[PDB]
Design a protein around this ligand. Structure first.
Ligand code: ZN
Lengths: 630, 630
C-alpha cells in the first residue's frame, strides 16, 4: 500500500530502549525553556508580501499532547516539544530573545537609546514579526546596531525585515560581522547549489506532511521559514582574534572562531550582566560537522579548542549562557560543565575517530564502532539531533583520508545501476530476492533490507514490490531515528519511492554580493561540453560601476575568467556595467535593449558573447535519488 | 595457485585498445627527455650512512628492452621507460637538473660565485650523491642558496645531504621557501599518519617486487628513495602573491600558488635564461587532487587559475619550461599550448564534475560518465599516471558534497563484515556464489568480480578459494591499469591476501619542528578511552627553551592542550624543555634521569603526568585492509 504503515513490534521495543537507558527523569531543559517568557502569542501565522505562508506552527499541535508516540523517537519527541517553547523571552538586564519565529533566534539588547540586534532570522517577514512583537511588548525602540553572528542564511536572511539600505547609508544604523563574512556567506552555496538544494529537500523534508507520520522537528528549529532572501553588506568587521567595543553605551566583547559552524563566526560576551552568547558552536544539540545537504567537512578540533578558549576567557565570570539556536542556561556551574562537555564532545569525536582510523578502521567501519563515553553520552545537548555521532565520525575520517576505504575492490566500482543487474541475477532472480529480503524485514533487520533491496530498486526502476518494500523498510528506520535529518530523509525518500518525484515544482542581493570571478566560475560549471568541443574564443569585459576588468578565454571545452587583465589581440571587447549584467543573467532584461539604452558597448566581433551564452546549459532541480534516471 | 598468473585474452585485448586510440606515433617526449644529457652513470647505487640501500635502478633493466609486455599498461610502460632517462641534464645557460636520483628532481642554478639549489630530495644520501656528480662534472662550487619549491618530503627531505646547520646559522647559506611552508609541511601527515602510511604501502608498492609482474614506475618518478628524513627551517619566506629577488647576482621571480600540489607552493621564473620552473603544478602527468594514501582534497579550481596567471605573466616570454618532477619543454609555442591544456584540464575536471553533480550524478557514478575531451585526452601530460580522471572526479564531488551519495539506503549501512554473511547466504552462499563469479571471471567482468567476491572475502576471512580468486581478479585489473598507484595497489592487495600481511615488519627534525599544540593533539589522538574514562586531571606545563606555556586538561575521556594560559588551582605543575620532552617522547631517555640531571621541575602532586602517559596507547602499523581483523 502507498500509505504510511504503523510501527513494528521491533520499532516500538527500540523506542522502549531509548526511554530505558538514556536519562529523561531530568526534564530541567523544559524548566529553562519556559522560564522568563514574556508573552506567548496563541496563534502564530507570519505572511509574505506576495501573500504566501512564511511560518506557521498549528501543524505541530499534535505534540502539545504530552503523550508518547512510537512512530517518533522519544528523545527527538522531547527536542520537538522544547522547540515548541516559542515566544518572547527575558534573559538579561537588557537582554531579550525571540524564539520559534524561525529556525534561528534573534537577540535584542537595549542600548540606553535604541536596539542592538543579533542576526535576522531567514526572511524579512519573520524579522518584521519579531520586531513588531518586541516593539508592542516592551516599547517601540529604533534599531541602531545589527550583528551578524556568522555567515549562514538562517541568521542574515531577513535583514531588510529590520532595516533599509538608506538607514545604513546615512550612518544611522551599524552592521557588524566577523571578518571574512561575505566570503563565507556565498562561496559554498553556489557551484554545487542545485545538488545541495535538491539533496536538502530530503534532509529538511520540504515534501513532508507535518504529523507523527511525517516531519516533527529540525532540532535546532521546528523547521526553516520559507520566503525571499535578503543580505546587506557589513559596515564594520571584527578583524583579528576579537575586539572589545562600546555601542549605544553597551559593552560588547567579540571572540572570533573561524571554522566552527562557519568559516566566519564569533562568540559575544556581555560583561555588565555577565551573559555569554556562544553563537552556533554551543547549542542544544550535537551540530553537523558535515551537513547531509553537502558541504566541506568542518574542523571539529578547532571547534573544541575555540569552545575551550571561550570557557577560560568567559565561563568563570559568565552566570548565564545562551545561543542563536535554542535556549539558555543559568548558574555558572551548569555553564562550565556544559562548555567542558561540549568542548570534550567534538574533541572526543575528532580524536577517537582518528584513533580508530589509525588502527585501520575504514570509513565503512567506524560509525558502528565509535560509541560515546557515559559522561557525554548522558546529557541532552550532546544527543545527535542535528548532527549525529555516526555521520560526523565518517565525515572526520573522510576529511583526513578521503572517501577511499583502502581496499582496491572499492577503487574502481561500477555505477550501482550497472552492477544492479548482476546483484539481482546472483541472488535468485527478482522475486526470490524479495521473499528472503522480506524474511529479513520480518526479523527486524531494516538497515540491511534498505541496502540490499536498493540494488533491485536500481535494477528494476518500476518494480512496485521493490519500491514500496524499500519504502516501509526505510520509513521504519525513519520512525526510530533520533536524528531529525535522518528521519526527514528516510521519510522523504519513502514518499518519493511510493508517489514518484514532483513533476510539477534566485535572490538579487546574493547575486549582487556574489564576486564577478565566482559568478563566472559558476558560468563555467553551467557550460555544455557538447557545444563546447572544438571551438575557441577570447572575450574582454569592462565593468565600470565596479571598475574591474576581466578576460574570458575558451579552449578545450573550458571557460577561463581572469580579473583585471586583458589582451588586445583578443576576439571581442565588451563594455557593460555589473548591476545590469546581473539583470541580464537574472533574466529581467534582454541584451539588445541594454544596447539601445546606451550601456552595452561592443567592439570587434559582436557575436562571440552571444554564442558563449548559447553554450551555457541548465540543471533540472527535480532529479531522481532513490531510483536511476527515468 | 599463489603465484602471479599471465594476462588474459581480455587483458591483452584491452592493452591493444590502448595502443589503438592513444597517439603513440609522436615519441617527442623521448628526445626531450634525453635532451641536454651531460653524462649518464652506467651503474647507480646510492648507500646510506647506516649501510642500507637508498636508491638503485638495476631492478628496472627489463624496461630498457623497448618491447611491449601486456602484463603492464603500454602507456604506463612508456611513462616508466621515459622515467628511466636518468642522469645530469642542461636546460639553459646556467640551469641544470639531476633526475632519477630520487622520485623528485634537484635543480642547480649557476650563481657567478656559487650554486642556487631548488629542492633537496627524499633523503640526505640521494642529495649528496647528486651534488658530488654536479661537482666532478662541471666543477666543485659551494651551495649558498637553497629553495624549497613547496612543502613535501620528496623535495625538502634530503636538505642535510647538501648543507649543515653550521652554514645556515652563520648566514653564509640561505634557505628560501613559500610562506606557510613548514606548517604546511607537517600538519598533514601527522594525526592520521599511521593510517596514511599503511594505506600508502599499497599506492607506492613497498611490498612489491620490481618486475613486469610487479612495480614498474611511480609516474612522477620510478619510485620513492628510502632513507632518513631531514628538514631545516626557512631563513626567509616568500610572502604575498610573489617576490622578485637577486641571489649571487642572479635574478629570480617567485610566484606563490597556495592550494596546489601543496598548501604552500611557488612557481619560479628565471628571466636571463628565460626559463619557467613550475614546481608541482605542471608536470609530466595529471596530478592527484586526492592521493589515495589519504588526504584532504586539493583545490583543482585554484590550481587551474594559478596555471592561467603563470601563462599570462610568463608563458608569452617563456622559451623553456621545466618542473620538479620529470622533464622539460622547449619552444614557447609548445610551452603555451601545454599550459593552456594543463589549465583547461584541471578546470574541465572541476567544472564538468560539478556540472554532472548538479545534474544529479552521485559519487558512485561520476567517474564512469565523466570523459575528457579529445584535445586534452590526446596528449601525454594529461594521461592518468599519478592522478586519474576517475578518482580525481569523485574527490571534487567529495569536496563539495562529501561522501553521502544522497540515497538514505546508503545513510546508515552495516559494516561490510557484518553484512558480508548475509550477502553470502542469500546469493546462495559460499560455493555457488564462487562458480557464478568464476563464470563472470571467464567473461572479463573483472571490476565486477572484485566487488562481489570481496563480500565473501569479508564473510569468510580464511577462505582460500575466495581470496586467491579475488587476487587474480584484482591483479589482472592492475595489469591493465594505466595509473601507477592503481597498478601498485591492485598488486599489493593481491600479494597480501595471497601471502598474508607481513608479520615481521620517527624523524627528529620533523618532531622538533612539530608544534607543541599539534604534538599534544597527536597525544590526545593516541589516548585510550578505556583507561581514560571517569578520570579527571589538570597538568600545568612550562617550556622555557621555546618560552611557551601550556595547560593540559582531561575530562570526559578527552585531552585538551591550551597555550599561553594556565590556571593556578590546577592539579600539577611541571617545567621541562621542548628538546628533552622530545627525547622523552621519542624514547631516547627516561624521565627519572631528566629529573636528576636538573631539567625536570615538578610542583604539586607529581604523579599525574606519569598517569596520563600511561593512558596513552599505540597503533599497529600492519593492520588488515582486504580482510577483516584476523
Ligand atoms: Zn542555523
Amino acid at each position: 500500500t502507498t500509505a504510511p504503515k504503523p510501527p513494528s513490534a521491533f520499532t516500538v521495543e527500540a523506542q522502549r530502549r531509548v526511554e530505558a537507558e538514556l536519562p529523561f527523569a531530568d526534564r530541567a531543559d523544559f524548566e529553562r525553556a519556559d522560564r522568563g517568557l514574556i508573552r506567548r502569542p496563541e496563534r502564530l501565522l507570519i505572511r509574505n508580501p506576495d501573500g504566501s505562508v512564511a511560518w506557521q506552527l498549528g501543524g505541530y499541535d499534535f505534540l502539545l499532547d504530552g503523550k508518547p508516540r512510537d512512530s517518533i523517537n522519544p528523545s527527538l519527541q522531547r527536542q520537538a516539544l522544547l522547540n515548541l517553547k516559542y515566544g518572547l523571552f527575558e534573559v538579561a538586564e537588557g537582554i531579550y530573545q525571540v524564539r520559534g519565529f524561525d529556525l534561528a533566534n534573534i537577540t535584542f539588547i537595549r542600548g540606553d537609546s535604541g536596539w542592538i540586534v543579533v542576526d535576522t532570522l531567514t526572511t524579512p517577514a519573520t524579522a518584521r514579526a519579531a520586531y513588531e512583537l518586541v516593539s508592542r511588548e516592551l516599547g517601540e525602540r529604533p534599531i541602531r546596531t545589527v550583528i551578524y553572528s556568522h555567515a549562514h542564511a538562517d541568521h542574515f536572511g531577513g535583514v531588510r525585515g529590520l532595516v533599509e539600505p538608506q538607514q545604513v547609508a546615512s550612518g544611522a544604523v551599524q552592521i557588524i560581522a566577523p571578518a571574512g563574512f561575505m566570503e563565507a556567506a556565498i562561496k559554498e552555496n553556489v557551484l554545487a547549489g542545485n545538488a545541495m538544494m535538491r539533496r536538502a529537500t530530503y534532509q529538511y523534508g520540504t515534501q513532508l506532511p507535518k504529523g507523527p507520520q511525517g516531519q516533527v522537528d529540525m532540532a535546532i528549529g521546528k523547521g526553516l521559514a520559507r520566503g525571499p532572501l535578503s543580505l546587506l553588506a557589513p559596515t564594520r568587521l571584527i578583524e583579528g582574534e576579537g575586539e572589545d567595543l562600546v555601542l549605544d553605551g553597551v559593552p560588547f566583547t567579540f571572540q572570533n572562531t573561524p571554522g566552527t559552524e562557519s568559516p566566519a563566526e564569533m562568540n559575544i560576551w556581555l560583561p555588565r550582566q555577565k551573559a555569554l552568547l556562544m553563537a552556533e558552536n554551543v547549542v542544544g544539540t550535537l551540530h553537523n560537522l558535515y551537513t547531509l545537504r553537502g558541504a566541506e567537512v568542518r574542523d571539529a578540533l578547532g571547534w573544541s579548542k575555540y569552545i575551550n578558549q571561550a570557557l577560560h576567557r568567559f565561563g568563570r565570570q559568565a552566570e548565564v549562557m545562551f545561543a542563536v539556536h535554542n535556549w539558555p542556561r543559568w548558574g555558572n556551574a551548569e555553564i562550565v560543565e556544559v562548555l567542558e562537555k561540549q568542548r570534550d564532545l567534538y574533541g572526543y569525536l575528532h580524536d577517537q575517530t582518528l584513533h580508530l582510523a589509525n588502527q585501520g578502521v575504514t570509513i565503512g567501519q567506524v560509525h558502528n564502532r565509535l560509541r560515546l563515553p557515559p559522561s557525554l553520552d548522558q546529557e541532552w545537548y550532546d544527543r545527535g539531533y542535528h548532527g549525529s555521532v555516526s555521520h560526523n565520525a565518517r565525515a572526520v575520517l573522510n576529511r583526513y583520508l578521503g572517501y577511499y576505504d583502502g581496499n582496491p575492490a572499492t577503487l574502481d566500482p561500477l555505477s550501482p545501476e550497472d552492477s544492479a543487474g548482476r546483484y539481482v541475477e546472483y541472488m535468485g532472480g527478482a522475486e526470490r530476492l524479495l521473499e528472503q529480503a522480506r524474511a529479513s524485514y520480518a526479523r527486524g533487520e531494516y538497515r540491511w533490507v534498505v541496502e540490499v533491496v536498493n540494488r533491485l530498486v536500481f535494477a528494476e526502476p518500476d518494480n512496485r514490490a521493490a519500491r514500496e518494500l524499500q519504502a516501509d523498510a526505510l520509513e521504519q528506520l525513519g520512525y526510530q531515528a533520533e536524528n531529525a535529518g535522518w528521519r526527514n530523509s528516510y521519510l522523504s525518500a519513502a514518499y518519493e519511492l511510493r508517489h514518484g518525484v514532483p513533476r510539477d515544482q534566485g535572490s538579487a542581493d546574493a547575486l549582487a554580493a556574489m564576486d564577478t570571478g565566482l559568478l563566472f566560475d559558476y558560468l563555467g560549471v553551467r557550460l555544455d561540453a557538447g557545444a563546447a568541443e572544438g571551438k575557441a574564443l577570447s572575450i574582454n569585459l569592462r565593468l565600470p560601476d565596479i571598475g574591474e576588468n576581466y578576460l574570458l578565454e575558451l579552449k578545450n571545452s573550458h571557460l577561463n575568467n581572469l580579473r583585471g587583465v586583458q589582451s588586445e589581440d583578443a576576439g571581442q571587447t565588451v563594455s557593460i556595467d555589473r548591476a545590469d549584467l546581473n539583470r541580464l543573467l537574472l533574466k529581467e532584461v534582454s541584451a539588445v535593449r541594454l544596447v539601445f539604452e546606451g550601456k552595452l558597448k561592443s567592439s570587434g566581433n559582436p557575436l562571440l558573447l552571444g554564442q558563449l551564452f548559447g553554450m551555457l546549459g541548465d540543471f533540472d532541480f527535480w532529479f531522481d535519488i532513490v531510483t536511476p534516471a527515468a
